Symmetry: D2
């Protein structure tokens, strides 16, 4: 009957994101999915730092936070295990001992500079009490473009989901997925590879099966949102929680079990094109983080994507203690850091050996 000439971009099937950065996004994804390597999450907020300087009793100052990063970044040879570093806004503008800004320092060593672009958690104000959303989309492109000029080529945004009474509200499931999807699009348009982090928190008395159920439910909606917004699959990365029992459940899971549940959930929700999955440690111990990732890279279940790490706590705990916040502790701190980095590097390769942590 009646025909009409429309713009191809107005047709539902042609919603895939169009950006001149596509080629570079794929290249960054390539470097970020290097065998035997993972990411160092060093984007702790000024408030989280206070928590970090505790078992070592160090004051929370701008200078000490810079030394906190310098401890791990200026550690000779770390680029052997780390392919990218998620920096905090403050650290982006700080300089290493050699005078290079941290992004320049990383870029010179072949390490991709990354940046946490979200603006923190806030009450969801919908759904159930205790649920939270993430702010930061207003003025996003402006901020991202500036970070890109400073050398950053990838970013990270975190949304959280709190399991309560074995479930999570649909308000949270829908809203946080839309937030993550929009974030992915604005990032790619700004030239930064987006690390989409939908963390189903370990907090709670739930068992591994509950975590498995909620994680699958939360993750598949993130995927649906991403398809709605037309993300470039070849140009993004996922940063999920591992499927493990709750922190206050009193139950433990064998590495084989975590790998089974974690890998099964991912495969059941993620498109096979997803380039990589960089696990957050989120509450697991340094050894758990390594053992689990290792068992995950030994799973017989389908996992076409790169499975590695994007650890903060699981790579810093020991390094911080041995360092003690003192110069004389750098050598020991750096030794502690590289060891954890090496263990996780081998875990990525499925050759982790627990005896090495004995």
């Amino acid at each position: 009957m009646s025909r009409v000439t429309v713009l191809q971009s107005q047709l539902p099937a042609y919603n895939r994101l169009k950006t001149p950065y596509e080629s570079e996004l794929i290249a960054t994804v390539k470097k970020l999915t290097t065998p035997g390597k993972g990411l160092l999450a060093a984007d702790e907020s000024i408030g989280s730092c206070t928590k970090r300087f505790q078992p070592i009793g160090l004051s929370n100052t701008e200078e000490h936070r810079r030394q906190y990063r310098a401890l791990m970044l200026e550690a000779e040879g770390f680029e052997q295990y780390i392919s990218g570093v998620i920096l905090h806004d403050e650290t982006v503008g700080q300089k290493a001992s050699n005078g290079q800004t941290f992004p320049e320092y990383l870029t010179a060593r072949g390490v991709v500079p990354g940046i946490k672009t979200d603006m923190g958690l806030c009450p969801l104000l919908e759904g159930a009490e205790g649920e939270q959303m993430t702010e930061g989309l207003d003025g996003y492109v402006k901020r991202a473009s500036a970070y890109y000029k400073k050398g950053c080529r990838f970013c990270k945004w975190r949304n959280v989901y709190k399991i309560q009474n074995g479930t999570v509200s649909e308000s949270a499931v829908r809203f946080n997925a839309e937030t993550l999807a929009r974030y992915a699009i604005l990032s790619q348009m700004s030239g930064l590879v987006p690390i989409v982090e939908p963390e189903v928190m370990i907090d709670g008395k739930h068992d591994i099966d509950t975590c498995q159920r909620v994680s699958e439910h939360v993750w598949r909606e993130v995927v649906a949102a991403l398809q709605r917004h037309g993300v470039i699959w070849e140009g993004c990365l996922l940063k999920p929680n591992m499927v493990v029992p709750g922190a206050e459940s009193g139950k433990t899971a064998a590495p084989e079990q975590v790998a089974h549940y974690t890998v099964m959930t991912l495969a059941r929700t993620m498109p096979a094109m997803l380039p990589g999955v960089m696990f957050l440690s989120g509450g697991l111990s340094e050894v758990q983080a390594s053992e689990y990732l290792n068992a995950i890279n030994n799973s017989p279940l389908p996992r076409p994507y790169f499975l590695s790490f994007s650890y903060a706590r699981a790579l810093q705990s020991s390094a911080l203690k041995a360092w003690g916040g003192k110069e004389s502790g750098l050598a020991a701190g750096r030794r502690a850091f590289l060891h954890r980095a090496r263990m996780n590097s081998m875990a990525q390769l499925g050759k982790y050996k627990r005896s090495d942590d004995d």
Copy 2:
């Protein structure tokens, strides 16, 4: 088989927003939906004021903008036709000649103080070129609660939809609907009655049927998004465009036709509980804005909601001309305003008489 104890608030059917401000939001809606009254939209941005100040060749200063606003906010007797005023952020802080801030000034005169809370249009960056989204959800509650303290009781947020090639992208239909829905929730939680404004623009060569189809499509997704975010229907208002032919279509619709198409489109998409629809003028001439509203209020079609106006251009055009800027044309300015406000007050009641309106009115489209 297995049973589990969950919070009622975690179940899909219990997503309705819970706020202690509910009673107050409803009360405000009542005032905002008073027979024979509409809203004055004086929320033009600082930049937009440069577009209002061109014809009269006025200096775009903070003092002048205050006069621009005071020109009509102080015009005695206007509260007989205006039940609420949408103020710009800067005007909320300015004072009237009496020393009271406009919010305080308006309240004492019975006129509810409102505030435009959105942060402007930006490129959608999804869908088709030319489409735009609206920012402002970050730190919203913090801004809204502050406005509340200053006396504001309702807010306004505007999203736009550009008809191109007889259609709009779904990226735009979905995203702007979600933005508007979230906006409504945060406003109600902050104590401000939200005026949801999904404007399908008159820009383009599209005819009235194309505007009808697009408006229906856009509006229903806004309603769907509102249902998912659980808005309190009894406490919000809609500010839509009227369904009319495009500005460059070469055609002009008769009042009866615009009434039919507009009232029909609202009925097919809006829940019967929606307390009120406050039309934007969107480029129509001052007379058309009055003529069409009057016809709308004489439509035999279903319309349980209060139908009125929330005009900016269709209420300030001539009153601005007569004013010119000097306090000399103040009487002439406040005279042209009260007349336009009276014509629309009559329209709300469906008693508008074209014979009482100037026999000459040019489009306010740009």
Copy 3:
């Protein structure tokens, strides 16, 4: 940059159903929304007749069912209170005393003939145990077209929702809404005004508030599905449950409360264009059905749509008892029927007086 010529019907905003029957569908709606009139639901299945015939000692035969329908359809005077009658597939082909098929007989006497087109409830096989879906869409156009030929001008389809533990599953909320919307579209395309019936059953121990919550949640999705399918709003009717406490709640609700909750729920979910809402009695007594409808038509809440009845049990109970299935009880049964039809007629007008029912 790139344009494409497509069919206007391929665009999302142009999904409204196109049918040459539109004008007739609206004309039918007008007759079914006539002040002081309602619908008689006489579409009981063979199995339901058993439940109606058992308590009066009447054998369930093809002949006794016809006599069961004749009892009401030939109660001269009922046309004054009944604008339409929902017939069972069997009755459509039966004949009244004068040799006319019931549809012909009804049409000749000013009543619009309708037909129940759904094929029964079945286990949902998704969501929670006890939930059911409704079959009937396969070959629907063929059946509906045959009905139109015989004189039917509107139809009815029933889906049910069972409140369990104060909630219902999304699987049911979504699936049944999609079933109803598809059914509405196919009915209109066939020239039959569709009566959409999403019955939130009174069964259970829930209070009126829970019914309100579930009814609003169920209603809204039915509407959403109708919008996605592009139904002609000016050509359909809703046949919902009134909002009242559960049948096993041991709680009673005053007429004014039912009216407030019911009218408020419709207003919050139904587009103002919906032409009419014909309530099902669903377990309420004959008196509650009249009392509640009467209060609904006296409610100060918004209600652009016509509010009337589409009752089965609430119009048949007393009549079946007085009739006793005996030709010698016809006069008594018909007086009871007319009385009940009369009470609901005055209820539609908001002039029902409880004293009239003693």
Copy 4:
């Protein structure tokens, strides 16, 4: 603030279909995903046999149809290439030359019996003219459980999408996806592994890119519908079209381009858990079907799922011609058939040699 005890099955996150047939379903997938083996699509309807017997002039009779399928089913040694066969309704009840039903015959021969359970295409009656939906969900569990009792362990259901003007309507995209997902669920509940077939037809002037876009769009929705209905991913299979230019586009794609586009589209839409993808020949020639599958199994792109075949035409065409419907032609026919079977078997392994195959294969598109 208040709590409530509900069934776990009432919560959104717990919607995975639960069936006692899960184990057997997965076991069945394992059989249907055996390296070097594919499926034989012999579910042609009586009306579809009319056009297949047209060439060799064979009367469409229950008997002639029985032999037509026996030709391939009783082809000695075909089990080395075929893991399962999709039968038509009547063939399920017909008998092999040894007196036992084909299902019993195939089972004893290590082959899995399958049944096509859809009731055919019908006008969509929504969206655009030319679009079709598929009927068959009414009384499904009853029919399916009947087939299961007769030996069947998997089924097939086909929905089609027609590219027109470079696109398809959302009405079709949504409705056909929901139909497939409900079909999948009812199938698993009846103990049958469902092969979900969303065919974006090769018909049209469109190029490979338009087919890619449309296929991506259509398939992701099927996936969305499957997640909403809670399908058991570990127990189902997908049967899509390959991404190739239209039959009337005038262009023909090189094996490796088809591989790139097809695999890329699958990876962007399908969850990594999806057991396998059994392609349809959809009109391609016998050799094209084999070449493309070979190139597909040689793609460097991510593809965790078993990629194989489930052809009807591309496997029967020449074998049928050789048979001629004559008894003396059974040998000639079964050689051609077992040949094509071997070719696709190699293609499944990415070890297909174009040399070892015919030199000229005509289009099977009508």
